[PDB]
Amino acid sequence: RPDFCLEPPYTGPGKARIIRYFYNAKAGLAQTFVYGGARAKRNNFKSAEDALRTCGG
Amino acid sequence: RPDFCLEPPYTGPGKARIIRYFYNAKAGLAQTFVYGGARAKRNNFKSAEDALRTCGGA
């Protein structure tokens, strides 16, 4: 499983409120979070399915 | 252009020496750098052509 999948979701310094997905490795599920629109980390996906495809295995 | 493409490269805290590519802001070229194996930032590509597809405008 890529290491970034175990990082907490990162809102970042931007002032937007974009609903993105992250993989919650303790739950084993994709969940949503508020992304600020700038300087994303890699545990940040545009759909539940992409988070699980990338990080679920 | 994605907002990470004009950042300096980021080796990170890892002790590996993996040769990756970054988009060099000023020169407008993909360039190699030493990546430590962990905690990549997004201006970090496995090839020059990936750096240019993503960050070129160059």
From Swiss-Prot, chain A:
The record marks K15, A16 as: Reactive bond for trypsin. It comes from Bos taurus. It is found in: Secreted. The chain holds residues 36 to 92 of 100 of the full protein. GO terms for molecular function: calcium ion binding; molecular function inhibitor activity; potassium channel inhibitor activity; protease binding; serine-type endopeptidase inhibitor activity; sulfate binding; zymogen binding. Keywords: Disulfide bond, Pharmaceutical, Protease inhibitor, Secreted, Serine protease inhibitor, Signal. GO terms for cellular component: extracellular space; serine protease inhibitor complex. GO terms for biological process: negative regulation of platelet aggregation; negative regulation of serine-type endopeptidase activity; negative regulation of thrombin-activated receptor signaling pathway; trypsinogen activation. Residues 5-55 form the BPTI/Kunitz inhibitor domain. It comes from the Eukaryota. Inhibits trypsin, kallikrein, chymotrypsin, and plasmin. Disulfide bonds join C5-C55, G14-A38, A30-A51. This is Pancreatic trypsin inhibitor.
Swiss-Prot record, chain B:
It is found in: Secreted. The record marks K15, A16 as: Reactive bond for trypsin. One of its GO terms (cellular component) is serine protease inhibitor complex. The keyword Glycosyltransferase does not apply. The keyword Disulfide bond applies. Disulfide bonds join C5-C55, G14-A38, A30-A51. Residues 5-55 form the BPTI/Kunitz inhibitor domain. GO terms for biological process: negative regulation of platelet aggregation; negative regulation of serine-type endopeptidase activity; negative regulation of thrombin-activated receptor signaling pathway; trypsinogen activation. GO terms for molecular function: calcium ion binding; molecular function inhibitor activity; potassium channel inhibitor activity; protease binding; serine-type endopeptidase inhibitor activity; sulfate binding; zymogen binding. Keywords: Disulfide bond, Pharmaceutical, Protease inhibitor, Secreted, Serine protease inhibitor, Signal. Inhibits trypsin, kallikrein, chymotrypsin, and plasmin. This is Pancreatic trypsin inhibitor. The chain holds residues 36 to 93 of 100 of the full protein.
